[PDB]
Amino acid sequence: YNSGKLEEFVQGNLERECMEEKCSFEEAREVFENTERTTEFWKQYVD
């Protein structure tokens, strides 16, 4: 869930971060970065 140590400097993997453990909508919007794409994605991942 992006504790903020040695996982920000990695590439872009929405799974290792968002799927596996935990994650904010914002989190997606850094790798993903298309916040529209990520909100739709968000409506099948939130709740």
The identity of residue 26, as a single letter, is: E
Binding site per annotation, positions = 1-2, 7-8, 15, 17, 20-21, 26-27, 30, 36, 40, 47
Give the method of determination: NMR
Write the DSSP symbol of residue 30. Answer: H
Which residues, other chains included, contact 45 with Cβ-Cβ below 8 Å and sequence gap of 6+?
A: 18
C-alpha 7/C-alpha 30 separation (Å) is: 13
Q: CATH number for the domain including 7?
A: 4.10.740.10
Which residues, other chains included, contact 46 with Cβ-Cβ below 8 Å and sequence gap of 6+?
A: 25
Report the domain count for the chain: 1
Binding site per annotation, positions for Mg(2+) = 15, 20, 26, 30, 36, 40
Q: Residue 35's domain spans which residues?
A: 1-47
Q: 3-state class of 7 per DSSP?
A: coil
Hey, how many other C-beta atoms are within 10 angstroms of the C-beta on 38? 20
Q: Tell the burial category of 28 from Cβ atoms under 10 Å away from its Cβ (0-12, 13-18, 19+).
A: buried
Could you identify the residue written with the tokens 């909100």?
A: 39
